Write a protein that binds this ligand. Structure first.
Ligand SMILES: Nc1ncnc2c1ncn2[C@@H]1O[C@H](COP(=O)(O)OP(=O)(O)OP(=O)(O)O)[C@@H](O)[C@H]1O
Ligand SMILES: Nc1ncnc2c1ncn2[C@@H]1O[C@H](COP(=O)(O)OP(=O)(O)OP(=O)(O)O)[C@@H](O)[C@H]1O
Ligand SMILES: Nc1ncnc2c1ncn2[C@@H]1O[C@H](COP(=O)(O)OP(=O)(O)OP(=O)(O)O)[C@@H](O)[C@H]1O
Ligand SMILES: Nc1ncnc2c1ncn2[C@@H]1O[C@H](COP(=O)(O)OP(=O)(O)OP(=O)(O)O)[C@@H](O)[C@H]1O
Ligand SMILES: Nc1ncnc2c1ncn2[C@@H]1O[C@H](COP(=O)(O)OP(=O)(O)OP(=O)(O)O)[C@@H](O)[C@H]1O
Ligand SMILES: Nc1ncnc2c1ncn2[C@@H]1O[C@H](COP(=O)(O)OP(=O)(O)OP(=O)(O)O)[C@@H](O)[C@H]1O
Ligand SMILES: [Mg+2]
Ligand SMILES: [Mg+2]
Ligand SMILES: [Mg+2]
Ligand SMILES: [Mo]
Ligand SMILES: [Mo]
Ligand SMILES: [Mo]
Ligand SMILES: [Mo]
Ligand SMILES: [Mo]
Ligand SMILES: [Mo]
Ligand SMILES: [Mo]
Ligand SMILES: [Mo]
Ligand SMILES: [Mo]
Ligand SMILES: [Mo]
Ligand SMILES: [Mo]
Ligand SMILES: [Mo]
Lengths: 268, 245, 245, 268, 245, 268
């Protein structure tokens, strides 16, 4: 291998050539924001619940950013399910639904952002994104909308028009892109169970599990969007994620401190 | 039911970046052929990236950058190719339009004028998928996602070779290379060698909702793009696996 | 003299958000009626927000947010309704256009195509007026400000009821509710109960310069919007108090 | 009342329903930027006068921001009156005049911004507005253009085509929206008098007055745009404003320090 | 070879800011003349800045600001003049379009409608050249750079005087002022007094690739702009020094 | 002279009037960012070379910004020469080539920006530019793309369609506009020689030279774009520039420290 053998392959072959693909795999690996943590705040599980859920999390973010650099992404929730229902009933394709859902995650980032403004924390992704480096350096946190940018170019699911990559996937990919040290999903249950705990009375709590074990137990599409599990197995930087209950006071803070609250899902 | 078709009268044409890389000798005849097509079809013309993306991949990989950083860097080269092609067609009322405009206002723009040009790369950007160090969702893939989301009448891919062969026909095994007049996305996806189309194109074909076939043709032979837009078989047909309603 | 009319040939149509909330059963017939109208009128179609704004008001008020924070949050839902309606009309050359485009380039867009869709909410945003915790300048109000500033030939408001009644006809007093075929902004403004139009609409009518009447009609009855755009009386007429030159 | 009784009203009634309007009035009241002060720098009374007026105010802003968070909005002035005259003579409506005047307030913010850049203070509102939280936290001040965003949707006055909501109203509404602690208008007279002091020789100075008293004395449209007085009476957060002479050295600084310079106008 | 012409059918018209400064008495007849021209030509109408730029130069220079700060401040006034002129032509389908749109999508916009209006000032902004405290690349200069880059059929400059004289005809030497029916950029550039056109215009004429002559005419005399767009000699002709292919 | 004699000239004469031009020359001269240094990082001479060239310069920028405010502009390089070749062969004019080359300088700023993000340093010019004052105050450096904004309005050269004002000129004009104290071009040779050192074996090193002397020796278009030399002679603020080898470790740092490394080119 060499800077030169890669450059010759890159000039002489299709990007599909297994030979070129293999030389590229050997390249150096730079992490852009290695000391940051990405947190997803659920739309339906947290923000839709209003101040009883949101105010304690705002207080935690404000306290936690003294010691931890944070990128806080928002989910969408019930207004996006309403939009998907209307648009699906009209026969609109997954790519149009994807744009509609983004607007809802944007609303939620605006609302969270207004509660955090007096602490110096901006909402970003609007005007820019190199908003992010300066913000992280000075106030240690930023708020972003969690939907991926695919919009009309969204790959559809095998069945149905609901966009398969939504705000769990958007936040995960950003953590992965930037080479962040940790990805925490904030939801409204303690973590993963053997069955939906809202719907099933004798579900058992699962502290740690791999993607393969989740699939073997039928949990592919339970507490996280199922494509996130596959993205996790391909990831270069973020090879596990943590799911925690945002409705328990202090839970986010304890996860940032290294406590094993919730469920840890590992790529292998 | 499958979703509705938003722009059922649209034809989408993707122009490979390596066609553009050949300069005036390839571009002037392609531009003359496109000029003659404007009164016949309603066209979204999408450009790929070509060799300058390979250069910015070489620099970016040497700097260690992740696949979500390389993806927008390649996309910029597809954008430049689009501006070059649109400038050559300006006197015919054709301009380059940005992705947001493509996604939300293509219908008013194709009411205003007979064709517009845009970038074939999709806006995956820093949210590109991990796994390979080379961005997987490139120009073929982006053009097909768009064409299929719109429910367009077709997607035709215009390359610097006659179509798909059993081996790279410009490669060290070119003596063994047999031309494939017809094939399926699923057969292709099982093969292992190089192709003139993104491997991700074959994946998005498996989930397609509308477009049943895509033809790959040689843009260096005048007349082939015109014939392909009339459904004539002059390159390699790729069956997507959409079955009719 | 009163100011000139910028677009005297324009017809403005505001579609209530709660019409959109009914889904395909209401939207498909409205879209078919709009399709038939495109060759007859030059249309600016503006969408309201409906029930999702009520949800984001519930969340925002529970978080304590001021009226200048709630206003852009509601406006976003009017925007989404506009994108949905434009997508259904894409094959007819119709797209959604943003507010800056509406304010500065509507004439070139209605030269390009027969109709465009935009949000009815006005851009008051964080500069919304204080007093009520509910944003006062909403979709009816924004659509009238625009129509009157342009000196448009008319504004027609398309709702999920026949027009204005003496009481909410879906409300606990609906037995007492009498239909009003005709009324004035000044009479309405003196009454105290609920209405199917913003109370701010009645205020901006008092300062209007051009538009003399606004008709409220039931978009759930096919044909009423078509009849209203020809000046036929099929809902409630509201006299603005503009007197002729 | 309850989070639940409000949500049922919000689902079941028109936003015009007096019942729903009354439940919403009882909601919590969050101030977004409670520790900031909004200052309007007059276009005709200050910036049009050039460096004899502007340079001492630049020095004050730089000194004052050490102890005070500032949002500094610009007025428009003589170039906007020129534009209004041309556009009115053509019969153009108030909404078109509103766009033209905004451009002039933008120019003035750019000029002030360039004098403040080497002190770290940005002009914002261009690319964003969540420019504001980060800027306020790090350099304690930002510059914005003072015109409201209504543009073509401007409500016209009862008579004539001059936009009734201009830069006094733009700055006031922002202070009110963000729940700021103080709103200071910087002009070229000591404060309110019983008559225009430029035009009337025996005008008397008025240190403090309510909106109702101003109206009873015919001062509805004297030193402030008259709709500001009505906006002030409806305000939730900013229930008085202060008008001071920017041409007196130190006057802005003393107002920020709590000194009763100029005139205080109260909602009631 | 010289470069190709991008929009060979385009006519560019630059309207001086001081024409606009005269208000309705000058603007209404100019707008009526432009209305009559729309079916005859494909027009890019570009406005200069006029007296408000002189005011913002007075303020900016008193504050000490460099020439790269004054340039965008003047350009804003050319922009406002463009919005005013476009509003008067809205009912004819004409709107103001921003510089990025002019640079990249003018062809689709002149397919959509018969004329658009933009700012004549070029986007030199904070990268304006040093030397003078007054921005050199102003409205005449910007309009010519654009017209020549596009390879337009012509540029006509519409001013408040009959053309170029040997002395300012509104100046203290006006008794000595002789009218110049024809002249060259090179002769002009060697003279020292004031002119009704930017001195930078004469420099960019020396490097021009396509446009051979520019006519300066009096927009206060109805009919002169119409005659000039047909090549009739009714003002001062300026020969650029482009020699034919 | 006076604030008043200038204002009368400005009202009464064409901007071409030598009399008005002369009054304006006497105006005050404000420097917007007097304590900053503009650095151009060459596209072909540095960034195209990859990490052996770029990584040591990233480390220098990070160290140097502790004591020096920096605006770091990027050049374009081989991908822009490729684009110019394709577009020239088609007969496209200089103004269209100018837009294409800007995209390449943008790519290079993005790549450099991603290596600097974890140090707080943003890429700007994207969303704004009053990005610059806040960034400079808080992290002491920003990255921008070095191409001028002229685009389609680019003045062409006397011969040929290559844009004559490219990234050397873009960076120089910004330094000059903002009244910066120093302009450093980072290239791949020690400085100016009497002949191209890549092409000529007995070229002699030149430590210091004026524009006029460079012209007399046929060096008008050697190590800098030749119009930069003419811009330098007209400049009000930046009346000399320094050219240094970015491939020598520490060279940039030593230039920022006042060491006479490389070549100093003076306006007179
Ligand atoms: N096996 C399981 N273990 C735990 N929770 C489960 C399981 N299966 C389903 N769930 C449900 O997953 C929900 C959380 O995921 P969900 O995506 O709904 O929240 P969210 O992140 O707020 O979504 P959005 O942000 O898209 O609104 C829980 O409320 C729980 O009821
Ligand atoms: N099986 C195959 N059949 C045909 N061509 C192949 C095959 N494998 C490799 N190739 C090569 O693919 C080349 C096309 O390269 P590529 O497909 O990257 O260019 P492009 O499509 O113009 O680029 P872009 O994707 O940026 O638009 C052909 O020139 C050919 O040499
Ligand atoms: N006096 C009245 N006459 C008629 N309808 C009334 C009256 N008072 C209340 N309403 C109610 O107003 C409802 C319309 O609700 P609203 O007007 O908020 O919806 P919309 O106009 O579709 O919403 P948006 O303003 O977001 O576009 C009708 O369904 C009716 O029940
Ligand atoms: N009764 C009064 N008391 C004090 N000043 C008054 C009174 N009536 C009128 N004025 C005038 O109000 C002027 C200040 O208000 P004005 O809005 O003109 O300034 P401004 O904020 O610079 O405006 P803009 O920013 O819109 O240019 C004073 O110059 C004064 O002459
Ligand atoms: N030699 C000359 N011949 C003709 N007019 C001259 C000459 N020298 C000066 N002028 C003056 O130039 C004036 C035009 O002013 P100017 O050219 O600045 O306005 P404009 O072109 O309308 O402005 P802008 O450049 O902002 O569009 C004429 O009114 C005339 O008085
Ligand atoms: N007389 C000379 N002295 C020194 N270098 C010279 C001379 N003449 C030519 N050069 C060449 O100038 C080159 C550097 O200038 P160049 O503009 O190519 O670099 P750059 O700033 O990277 O360009 P870009 O950023 O536009 O890619 C050197 O590599 C050197 O070979
Ligand atoms: Mg390919
Ligand atoms: Mg309503
Ligand atoms: Mg002139
Ligand atoms: Mo930011
Ligand atoms: Mo920012
Ligand atoms: Mo756009
Ligand atoms: Mo847009
Ligand atoms: Mo827009
Ligand atoms: Mo725009
Ligand atoms: Mo900022
Ligand atoms: Mo910032
Ligand atoms: Mo634009
Ligand atoms: Mo655009
Ligand atoms: Mo746009
Ligand atoms: Mo920034």
């Amino acid at each position: 291998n060499s800077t030169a053998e890669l450059e010759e392959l890159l000039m002489q072959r299709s990007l599909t050539d297994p030979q070129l693909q293999a030389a590229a795999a050997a390249a150096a690996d730079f992490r852009i924001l290695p000391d940051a943590t990405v947190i997803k705040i659920g739309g339906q599980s947290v923000i839709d619940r209003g101040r009883a859920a949101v105010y304690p999390l705002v207080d935690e973010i404000v306290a936690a950013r003294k010691n931890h650099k944070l990128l806080i992404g928002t989910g969408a929730g019930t207004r996006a399910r309403h939009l998907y229902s209307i648009a699906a009933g009209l026969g609109l394709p997954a790519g149009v639904l994807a744009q509609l859902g983004s607007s809802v995650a944007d609303q939620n980032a605006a609302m969270l952002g207004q509660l955090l403004a007096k602490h110096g924390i901006p909402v970003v992704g609007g005007a820019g994104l190199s908003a992010v480096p300066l913000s992280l350096a000075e106030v240690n946190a930023v708020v972003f909308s969690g939907m991926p940018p695919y919009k009309l170019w969204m790959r559809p699911a095998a069945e149905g028009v609901i966009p398969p990559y939504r705000t769990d996937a958007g936040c995960f990919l950003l953590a992965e892109q930037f080479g962040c040290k940790q990805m925490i999903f904030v939801k409204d249950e303690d973590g993963l169970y053997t069955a939906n705990p809202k719907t099933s009375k004798d579900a058992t709590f699962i502290p740690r599990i791999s993607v393969d074990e989740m699939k073997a137990k039928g949990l592919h599409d339970s507490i996280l969007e199922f494509p996130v599990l596959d993205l996790l197995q391909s990831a270069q930087h973020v090879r596990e994620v943590q799911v925690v209950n945002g409705l328990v006071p202090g839970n986010l803070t304890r996860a940032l401190a290294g406590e094993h609250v919730g469920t840890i899902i590992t790529a292998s | 039911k499958r979703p509705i078709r938003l722009l059922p009268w649209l034809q989408v044409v993707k122009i490979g970046g390596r066609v553009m890389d050949r300069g005036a000798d390839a571009i002037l005849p392609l531009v003359e052929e496109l000029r003659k097509l404007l009164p016949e079809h309603r066209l979204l013309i999408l450009t790929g990236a070509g060799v300058r993306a390979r250069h910015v991949f070489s620099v970016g990989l040497d700097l260690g950058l992740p696949v979500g950083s390389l993806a927008p860097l390649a996309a910029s080269e597809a954008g430049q190719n689009g501006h070059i092609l649109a400038a050559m067609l300006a006197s015919e009322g054709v301009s380059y339009v940005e992705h947001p405009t493509v996604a939300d206002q293509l219908a008013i723009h194709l009411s205003a004028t007979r064709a517009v040009v845009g970038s074939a790369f999709p806006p995956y950007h820093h949210h590109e998928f991990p796994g390979s160090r080379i961005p997987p969702h490139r120009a073929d893939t982006g053009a097909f996602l768009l064409a299929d989301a719109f429910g367009a009448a077709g997607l035709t891919i215009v390359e610097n070779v006659d179509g798909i062969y059993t081996a790279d026909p410009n490669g060290p095994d070119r003596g063994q290379a047999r031309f494939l007049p017809e094939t399926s996305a699923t057969d292709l996806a099982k093969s292992e060698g190089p192709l003139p189309v993104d491997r991700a194109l074959l994946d998005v074909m498996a989930t397609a909702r509308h477009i049943e076939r895509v033809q790959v043709v040689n843009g260096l032979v005048p007349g082939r793009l015109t014939a392909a837009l009339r459904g004539e078989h002059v390159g390699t047909l790729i069956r997507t696996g959409v079955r009719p309603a």
